[PDB]
Amino acid sequence: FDMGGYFIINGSEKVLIAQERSAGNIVQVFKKAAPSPISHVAEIRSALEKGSRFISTLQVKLYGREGSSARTIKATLPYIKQDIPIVIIFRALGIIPDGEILEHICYDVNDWQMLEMLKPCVEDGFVIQDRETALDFIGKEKRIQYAKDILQKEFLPHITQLEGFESRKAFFLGYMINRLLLCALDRKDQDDRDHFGKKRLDLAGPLLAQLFKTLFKKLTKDIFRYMQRTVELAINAKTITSGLKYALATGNWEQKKAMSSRAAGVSQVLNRYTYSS
């Protein structure tokens, strides 16, 4: 009658509890509170399916409120303190004439209501007219390569992190800006953060996948360390062995040492008062 689906750790029946997280790579527009210099925001939780698991979230904001003269659209890009106007991003991606940049946001030129909302943003970006002058507006030669790298590595790392896909990211940026101005016009309804379809559960497998990755990488750093010390085997199994064992025994996931930061009660001693329990 024993169904299984749990572990025996140091002679103790441990159960891995499913973890409810918000889905990633998901485009979501939300409205800001009454005292805010931003009225609406487009958010994207861009992460690699497998590849460290990117914590980088892009915010596309609509500065100014309803009734505030000239509303500007800026976006926060990972590892650059200020939120730069979207027109500069487009120029830094390759799209230089404002009207090719317009064509990337508005998919209809019979939609003046949306285009009029873009007019001040075009004016903001107008200071910078070239791609190299846009990469520079990411603080020379040093600040230009730095910029080049961020847009490839940290800006929208899902889709691709490769190279030439500059167009793909530009259309996507425009899609986000379209979905932003869409709730700004009150044409689309504000995204629901509690729609169960826009959530995910992390069971035994992915919780172990997270844990393992960290532990393996910690042995890789020891393998590299022994190699340096070898001024001319060494693989400590313990790091993986006890590493996994501690996370599953303590339930305090983390696991590095551990500490207070991270964890919970992820692994739990399996209930056995009655069968149904």
Binding site: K50, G205, L208, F212, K217, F224
Partner: peptide, 30 residues
Amino acid sequence: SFNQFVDYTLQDIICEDSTLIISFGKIYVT
């Protein structure tokens, strides 16, 4: 979930970052 991890995901982790100045191959589970 666990079966998926053991079968696929486990081979993935040992092969994505892996390789050092020494490279990693097929994972085996007793």
